[PDB]
Structures are given as C-alpha cells and as structure tokens.
Paper text:
The budding yeast homologs of GBF1, named Gea1 and Gea2, localize to early and medial Golgi compartments where Arf1 activation orchestrates the formation of COPI vesicles destined for the ER and earlier Golgi compartments. Here we present cryoelectron microscopy (cryoEM) structures of full-length Gea2, the yeast paralog of the human Arf-GEF GBF1, that reveal the organization of these regulatory domains and explain how Gea2 binds to the Golgi membrane surface. The HDS1, −2, and −3 domains form an extended helical repeat structure that is contiguous with the DCB-HUS domain, such that the HDS3 domains of each monomer lie at the distal ends of the homodimer.
Based on the relative numbers of particle images that sorted into each of these three classes (~30% “closed/closed,” ~30% “open/open,” and ~40% “closed/open”), the conformation adopted by each monomer within the dimer appears to be largely independent of that of its binding partner. The conserved GEF-HDS1 linker adopts distinct conformations when in the closed, open, and Arf1-bound states and therefore appears important for stabilizing each of these states. This possibility would enable the Gea2 dimer to remain more closely associated with the membrane surface throughout the activation reaction.
Author numbering:
A (entry chain A): 11 to 26, 71 to 260, 322 to 325
B (entry chain B): 164 to 230, 329 to 440, 455 to 545, 554 to 758, 765 to 779, 799 to 871, 889 to 892, 903 to 973
Amino acid sequence: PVTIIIKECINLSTAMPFLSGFIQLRLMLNKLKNLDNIDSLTILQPFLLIVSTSSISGYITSLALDSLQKFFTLNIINESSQNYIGAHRATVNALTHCRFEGSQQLSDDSVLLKVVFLLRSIVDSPYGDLLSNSIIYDVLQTILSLACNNRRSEVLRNAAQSTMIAVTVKIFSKLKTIEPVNVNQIYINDESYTNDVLKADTIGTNYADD
Amino acid sequence: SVLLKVVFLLRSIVDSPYGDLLSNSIIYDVLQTILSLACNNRRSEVLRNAAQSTMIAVTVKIFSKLKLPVVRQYLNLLLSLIAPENELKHSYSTRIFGLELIQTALEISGDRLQLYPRLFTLISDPIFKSILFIIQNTTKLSLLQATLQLFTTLVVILGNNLQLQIELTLTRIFSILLDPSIIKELLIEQISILWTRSPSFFTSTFINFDCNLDRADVSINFLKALTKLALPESALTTTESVPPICLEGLVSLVDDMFDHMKDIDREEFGLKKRDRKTEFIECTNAFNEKPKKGIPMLIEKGFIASDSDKDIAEFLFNNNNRMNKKTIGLLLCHPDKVSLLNEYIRLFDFSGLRVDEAIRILLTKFRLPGESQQIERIIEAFSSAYCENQDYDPSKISDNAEDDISTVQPDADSVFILSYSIIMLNTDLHNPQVKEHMSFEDYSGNLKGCCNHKDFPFWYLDRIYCSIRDKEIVMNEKWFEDAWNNLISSPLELLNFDRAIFKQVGPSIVSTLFNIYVVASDDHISTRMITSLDKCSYISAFFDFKDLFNDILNSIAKGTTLIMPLVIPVSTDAVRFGRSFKGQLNTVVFFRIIRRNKDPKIFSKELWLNIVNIILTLYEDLILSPDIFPDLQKRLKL
C-alpha cells in the first residue's frame, strides 16, 4: 500500500521549480510502513499542483492524471486515512480548474477523456457521497461545458453525454435518502428562473461547503 | 462513436453486480474483442485511451474475484501478448499496454496468488522469460521502464517464495550496469525502490539467498557493484543523477542497520550455515587453478573419509554446478592419474540406456578438451567403460529385435570406433564453420567392416542420426536456453546473522564513503556524508574490526589538516582551520568518537602516536587551555 505512492513518483519525476514537492515526498515516504499520520491532503498535493497549473506542458499533466487514475482504482486512500474527505474535496476542486497548453505528442482532446473518466469514477464511487455542493456543481458545469462545445471532437462529446447520463443516477438517487424539509406549509415562489447560466469553457488551450 | 458506446456498455455491465453472474467462458469472448480494440492503432487515439481505461477497470473487476478458467485463459492471453515469440506481429504500444496491465493485475491481488498452483506454474516459467529477455534485447526506453516497473513489483510483493527465479534475472542487470547511455540511468533509478520499500532487504537476502548452499551470492555482489558506481569516475559512463541514487542506497543501508542498533547490550553478545560455506567457496578457487595442490587441502577440511581415488572420484561425481568444468576436464586430461581415469567412469550406469543419451549426458559433465594427444586416453575410456557395465550374453545376438540395446555385444574396438565417429557429428553438422555439407551415407559407409570386421546395425545408426539431427544449430556463449537455463524442469539473532557482512564487505564500504567526501564541495552533501561515517564508526565499536576502527579515524585525522610569525591565537595552522569548513566539521565528530569509545585496548600504536599530536600541536598554537587537571594542581598547591 505504501509502495504505490513512491512508485510512479519514479515515473512522474522523469520530466526533464514545480517538481520540488516530489523529491520532498520521496524523502518523506521512505520510512513509514503504512499510511497512518501522514496528513493525506499533502501526499496528493504535488499532483494537484501539477494538474491545476496552466503554464506547464500537457504531457506531464497526462502522466500525472494517469497516475491519479491508477491511485484511485487501487483504492489506496482507505477510510482510515486521516482527513481523506479533505483530500477528495481538494482533488475534485483542482480537477474542475484544469488548464492545458499546446503539445505535439498526443492531443489535449485525447486526455480530456481521462479527466471525464476520473470524475465519473469519483462521483459514482461511495467516496463521492462525502463531497460538498459547490465542487459537484463546478464538476457538472465543467462536464456540461465539455458536452456543449463544438470545437472538440464529437467522440469526446459522446463521452460527455455518457458520463452526464451516468451522473444523473448518482445525484438523484440521494433524493430517496433525503427527507422532505419544512412541514408542508404553503409556498410562494420568489426565486429566479434565469439567474444562473452555462459556464464558459476553461479546460483547453489558449451554505455551499457543507 | 458506436465503438465508444459499446465499450461503455461493456464496462457498465461487467462492473455491475450482475456482471459477476456472467458465465466463466463468455468473459474471454468479450475480452478478445475489447482488447483488440486497444491493440489496434488505426482507430482514433482517444478511443484507444478509453480502451486503456476500461481495460484497467475490468482488470480490477475480474482479478478481485480471485478470493476460474477465465483467469487461466487471461494469463495465457497476456503471455502471448508480452512474450517475444509474437514480437513480429505485435507493436510496441500493445506490448507495453499489456505490460502495465499485467503489472496492475498482479499488484492488486499478488499476495493470494501463492496458494493456487496453476497460475503460479503459468507465471514462473513462461512469463518470467519475457521480463528476462526484454532487458538485453531492447532499445526503446519506455518498454524497458515498463518491464522494470513489473519486475520491481514482483520483487517487492512476491519475492518471498518466488526465490530461485530471482537469481538469473538479478545478476543480468549488473551485466548491463556494472559493465547504452540512458539505459544505465533508467536501471539505477528504477532499482532504488527495491531496496527502499522493503525495510531490511539486504539482511533478508543474506538470510535466504546467500547462506543457502544452492543459491549464489547477490547481496555482496550488489554492494560491490554499488560501491564501484559511487565514485565520480563512473560519471564518465553515466549521468550526474546516478551517484545520488547510489549514495542514497548506501546511506539507507547504514541507517537501517543503525535503526536495528537502538538498544542491545555489548556483554550480552559474548554462523551455523556460512561456517561450512567459507571453506566451501574457498576450495573452488584452488580447483579453479592448477588444482594438484588443492586435493590434499580438500581432505583436511573434514569433507571426505580418506584419500583413496574412489572418494575423490565420487566427490567430483556428485557436484555439477560448483566446479569449473574446463578445469576439471584438464585435471582429467592429465596422464599421471590413470587410476582415477579408470575408476571414476566405472561408477556410471549404462543399464538400459543408449549411447546417444550417454554422450548427451557426458558432454555436460565437461567441456570437450581442445588438446591433441591428451584426449586420446579419455576418448577411448569412453568406449572401454561399456564392456563390463552391460553384462555379455553371446547366445542372444540377432537383428530381429528392432530398437534393442541387448542385441549388440561390441568388443573394445567396436565401441572405440563408435565413440570416435559419434564425436565428429557435432563438428560436421551443427558447427557452421564447415561450409561444405557432408552427406551421412558416406559417413555410414566409412564404418564398413567395423562391428568385428562386419557392419553395425544400420537401423541403430539411422535412429541415432534421427535423434541427433533434432538440435541443428545455425549462424559459444550463453545464447539463451529453451529449458529456461534452469533446473526447474528437472533481535539478537539477526545481529548475529549479519555479523558476517562487515568481515566480507566493510573495507570496500569505508573506501566508498571516502574519496567523495573530499571531492564534494557542497555543504549539504558533506554533512550527511560525515554523519554516515560517524554511523559506521559507532557500528565498528560493538564488533572488534581493529583494522577498520583504526583506519577510519586515521583517515579523519589526516583529513582535519592539522598534521608567518604568530602573535588572540593567530598561527600558521589556525587560519587553515578557519577557512576550511571541512576541517571544522571533522574535529567535532572525531573527538565525539574518542568521547563515546568504550574499550581502551582497541586503539593501535600509530593511532596513539597520532592523537598525542593534534592536542600537542593545538597546545603549540596556544589554543586549548593548559590546566586540564586543576584538581591535581590544587592538591599539589602548585
């Protein structure tokens, strides 16, 4: 379990500054034997800083995002890990603010699907139930922006449609567990219909926190 | 888009709980298609990335159930994917994708794989061939990275029982490392996790790998490679990042052995396997030499009952992997041990065995000697041994029985010419230097009138030729082996155990510690370097190691640089102290060693001559105060 964090820190260290957290982590990770009191927000923080930052190239972001997918799919972040809900809040919040830069190898359109798949895995998993309203709203805004935009390829749009039809199930299934508020008193509508609007695209080349 | 849709439907149906109720044959029919989607390159790249993600997910789902024919067929499919037999048809991308796939599949549930035998049989012989073969025969960096990814996972999770197969792989890395420019950097960078993760990997290796008789020595070899890699001269054949990894390995080793050192009593201390292994590995060097003087040396070690030729002949008989074969062949070639020549081959058994299998077995016993006249006696005893082993029945000789050994009753000349003719087949056919191909019919006709002035049974020679033709060679060092190059087909206690590490390796380690501290200019590396040297100095005190515990402080004393007119205490050899940070740093740790030392007798004569200096010269440059014992001064009223 402790292996898989230092492991792939080998892989993502190979990027020849912004990488200093990785060698700091490698010095931190040698003698633990387990994930007990390591402040689990910090152990994912260098990856979050890599994916959130816009200046650096896209290839390192692709490698980091694949590493993050491999992180979650193992289920290394156990429930017993300290402050895990904060870590998942941080990684979703950093995911929704993703940025990109032009690159010759691969394509940004190729690796946006990794963001979509990782978001789908995050929300669909039980871990997604311990998320706040603002970050999930930002996630839905980002996915809807990806779906609506015509600049990207139609296959990625189809992936966006698929994950949205997937995530309606998860968001509305909690509607069964929740109980009705108030005492069924008479209600007068006084809220707007068009106060909100579709957020403009940002991932590409160029009573809420409860 | 329809391919993406069917992939999403497959992921949803297989990840669902109802996916567990799919049949244990249809999953393979699924997997062939949805993995061929990943392998195919002409499709869009985003579709391939979707294929990689959903293969990772379905691999999690299928291998989580292992806690059943589907996984067997699956490992067969990955074996066909990764292994180099099908390298021509498959591309780099599909191969590496399968490689990280099997890495994930083993890593998720590798602990439980020991119990079930069929998967382990499929993972030992054919799978490990792939990761062994890729290291010598690759150029692209990503594939080597992925293979070392998988190999490090095997060592870190499944290194306990998967024991012998660690040997042949692990040596070969040094053959490419100790002996390509970026490949060495990749190897060193990816191997460090091996020592880092497992907490006491070197001690565990010395426990199971070294002191066991059958296995060779790797940990001592590992340190002997690393210490050579430590010096900056290795930067002429490696990148600047390589020495930091090796220094991290060495400092981690000494820090782990110091973390083992927290609370043990020295008086409480005052091997049961390696004690044999010492003289056992010593006698091979005498046998890998002019070995006449080593034979009476062997008897003195309480190994053999008596100096009779039967006992030494039996001794050379049993062991096959130990003695160097060419040296034993040359020993057998000498003409002054003809008694040993007669009696050693007597203990062979040719009952119910053919001559072809006899020669096939016997060529493995020694390399065929390249001498002209010395082989004439052995290639003759080859024939002469066979007369008494097979009991003679002259009244039961006939050609009616086909594929029969009892029918032939050759004399000495018959088996002599048979053996002399059989040896020529490998040079005639298998060797490539003979460009003119010789027909076998002329070779058989050459043997006219040989079976006691008569022809040998032609069916016998025909079957022997049919046997030997099966191993034709085209175009010798090890060019790999179809049979795996292995015979698989055929707190006080731990300190006591690793007591023997330093007596083998320690001088090399302290030499490694020095010669980089001097050249290194940076403060941060140097303070850690000298702290490591302090750790070795403490470790020397528990044990005896007089040479090490003398030489290390002698080197430090020479390194402190203490051995115009003066006036505050200015001196010719005080400004050198102030200007040199290193001179400041060695004195404090040196006098710390002198402080916490326990035994008085351990120091030597010339060290004592050294430490009367330092303090005398510091007096002579008026640095330290003179009244070191004011109590005796007050007692004398002086």
